[PDB]
Amino acid sequence: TEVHASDLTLDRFIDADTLATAVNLPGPSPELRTVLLTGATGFLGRYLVLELLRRLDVDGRLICLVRAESDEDARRRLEKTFDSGDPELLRHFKELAADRLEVVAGDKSEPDLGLDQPMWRRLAETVDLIVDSAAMVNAFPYHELFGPNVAGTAELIRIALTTKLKPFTYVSTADVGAAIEPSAFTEDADIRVISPTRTVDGGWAGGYGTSKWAGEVLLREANDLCALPVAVFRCGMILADTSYAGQLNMSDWVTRMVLSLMATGIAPRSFYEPDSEGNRQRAHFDGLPVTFVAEAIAVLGARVASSLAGFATYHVMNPHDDGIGLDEYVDWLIEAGYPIRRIDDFAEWLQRFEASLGALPDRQRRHSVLPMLLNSQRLQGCSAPTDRFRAAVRAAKVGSDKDNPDIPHVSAPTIINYVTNLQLLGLL
């Protein structure tokens, strides 16, 4: 069935009194004291916990909405996130969280975020910035129910419109642009103009692209109606990195592939079409380390709450023409001494690869790329533009290198860290 942008109007989710008051609500406080974060337990979210606490002053407070039976159960579920076989991760967390961290039980999709009236009112009064982080990022079994998704974003927008206007940071995805003409899929575009309609299946469930799309559309509406300051971050593939050990996005294509290449021992000569002379063509994989992405999001979203007016979208992606793609990742694994070899003919590799995945133990096979079965050599970022995000990264000096700040390149230790992590997790 078809869902239209024109149908995702705020009046269908938020009461008129709230919407009317919001037009005359005082514009945001330029002071960043209290931040509300959703999805703190997620892969990206846990990194945003760390980065948002770093941005906050000694008088600052981060409030994490977490799914649980009680606040004790929520605070513990999040404590366990940073107690994952790395003592340095736990030490940074505890230090940064000390007296500045509040964790509350609740569901984004439930009315009032599943919170008591006094808590909800307190949040509406005090919150200076809302950060809406996708609990699942880049997952293969991505199957989100559209109803609860959309209702959730509307509930966050509602708290952003209630007592004072709140800057809203929304984690989105590059997949929003899957069905859109490449020239039209830009950072400046109104998502409602360039993508007026989508589809869901018969069970009202949507793919990653459609899920985030609806959120962007609703935020555009909040911007039109009420001048809500909004920052949308469309992320590409987000990579585990070496900041901490043991932090893996198990369900994404990359983690599954590294697992599949390792456990099978076999890679192809090239993942991409060879040239006329049969040789390996320059390629680029669009991946960013999670540390960078969390930092970028925390820094660029937090500065709206300075007091930057307007609707902003950023393409959080790796746009370098650096010749660093899937074949290089394989090169790095081989060079590190891992038991992986390559078959010349892509076609043979693929027949053997599929067969060999079928021979693996139950758990491995399940967390591999084998379920994703449905092709052929790839083709080669430079697809989607990154002008706004790149300028913002350089302007805000996002990253370690404060002299030449830029979007990083993927290097070998990041890839090797995938196998290291998979071993600690028992999967290899």
Swiss-Prot record:
Residues 37-297 form the Thioester reductase (TE) domain. Disruption phenotype: Cells lacking this gene are shown to be highly attenuated in a mouse tuberculosis model. Contains 7 domains: 2 C (condensation) domains, 2 A (adenylation) domains, 2 T (thiolation) domains, and one R (reduction) domain at its C-terminus. The first T domain likely acts as a lyine-specific peptidyl-carrier protein, and carries a lyine residue that is transferred to it by the first A domain. The C domain catalyzes the condensation of two isonitrile-containing moieties to both amino groups of the lysine bound to the T domain, a rare activity in nonribosomal peptide biosynthesis. Nonribosomal peptide synthetase (NRPS) involved in the biosynthesis of a unique class of isonitrile lipopeptides (INLPs) that seem to function as virulence factors in M.tuberculosis and to play a role in metal acquisition. Catalyzes the final step in the pathway, i.e. the condensation of a (3R)-3-isocyanyl-fatty acyl-[ACP] to both amino groups of a lysine, producing isonitrile lipopeptides. Belongs to the ATP-dependent AMP-binding enzyme family. This is Isonitrile lipopeptide synthase. The lineage of its organism: Bacteria, Bacillati, Actinomycetota, Actinomycetes, Mycobacteriales.
